[PDB]
Amino acid sequence: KFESRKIMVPPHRMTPLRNSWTKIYPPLVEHLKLQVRMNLKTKSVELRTNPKFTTDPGALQKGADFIKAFTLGFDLDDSIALLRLDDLYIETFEVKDVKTLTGDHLSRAIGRIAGKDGKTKFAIENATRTRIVLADSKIHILGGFTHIRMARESVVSLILGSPPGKVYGNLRTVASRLKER
Amino acid sequence: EQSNKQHRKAKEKNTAKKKLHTQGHNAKAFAVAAPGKMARTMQRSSDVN
Numbered sequence: 001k002f003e004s005r006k007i008m009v010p011p012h013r014m015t016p017l018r019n020s021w022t023k024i025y026p027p028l029v030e031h032l033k034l035q036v037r038m039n040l041k042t043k044s045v046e047l048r049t050n051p052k053f054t055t056d057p058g059a060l061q062k063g064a065d066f067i068k069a070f071t072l073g074f075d076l077d078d079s080i081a082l083l084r085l086d087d088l089y090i091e092t093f094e095v096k097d098v099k100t101l102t103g104d105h106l107s108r109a110i111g112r113i114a115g116k117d118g119k120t121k122f123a124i125e126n127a128t129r130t131r132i133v134l135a136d137s138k139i140h141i142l143g144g145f146t147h148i149r150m151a152r153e154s155v156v157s158l159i160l161g162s163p164p165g166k167v168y169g170n171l172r173t174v175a176s177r178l179k180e181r
Numbered sequence: 182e183q184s185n186k187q188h189r190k191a192k193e194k195n196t197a198k199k200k201l202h203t204q205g206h207n208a209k210a211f212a213v214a215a216p217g218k219m220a221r222t223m224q225r226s227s228d229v230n
């Protein structure tokens with residue numbers, strides 16, 4: 001029942017890991033009964049469940065999901081939400097997986113997804129209760145399964161060309177028919 | 182509320198120095214040597230018809 005994981009850390013998220021480690025190892029050790037160790041000599045977090053203390057078998061994968069969601073780019077508190085609840089998944093896709101774009105066309109596509117001052121991105125998060133990080137081109141979405149399909153459908157309607165005002169309007173309609181349920 | 186900007190098109194074959202060749206002939210070549218006299222005599226003889 002002694003078991004482990006080890007998940008790697010890309011370098012742009014290695015400063016914020018060793019910069020926010022103090023809030024990470026506690027709610028992995030007491031609340032979860034789980035034995036962290038971060039290797040630096042291969043740049044990777046490692047976890048192990050120790051057979052004595054632990055109760056929940058899903059603790060190990062709960063922690064691995066938590067650290068990995070911090071790895072892909074989501075801030076600390078959001079990853080904590082992944083640690084607590086039981087209904088949270090991440091879906092990742094690309095920009096070349098919708099429509100093959102390159103050159104300047106791709107930097108303008110990321111400009112429409114992100115909006116000025118982040119506004120358009122935030123709107124998609126706020127009216128869908130999901131959290132989006134938007135990497136180089138790969139786009140990552142965290143939420144519950146139905147919500148992330150709503151936010152995936154808005155993001156993909158933004159890559160293909162539709163302007164952003166249309167997606168605010170359709171977004172608030174989606175918000176109406178979401179909040180009632 | 183997104184309006185794109187008009188692409189101002191580029192014309193086809195309708196240019197004032199190409200209109201002059203579209204009829205049967207080169208219309209620049211059937212001209213006169215004194216347009217002022219052509220005008221004043223043309224008008225007068227119109228009135229006298």
Ligand SMILES: [Mg+2]
Nearest residue numbers: 189190191192
């Ligand atoms: Mg011009």
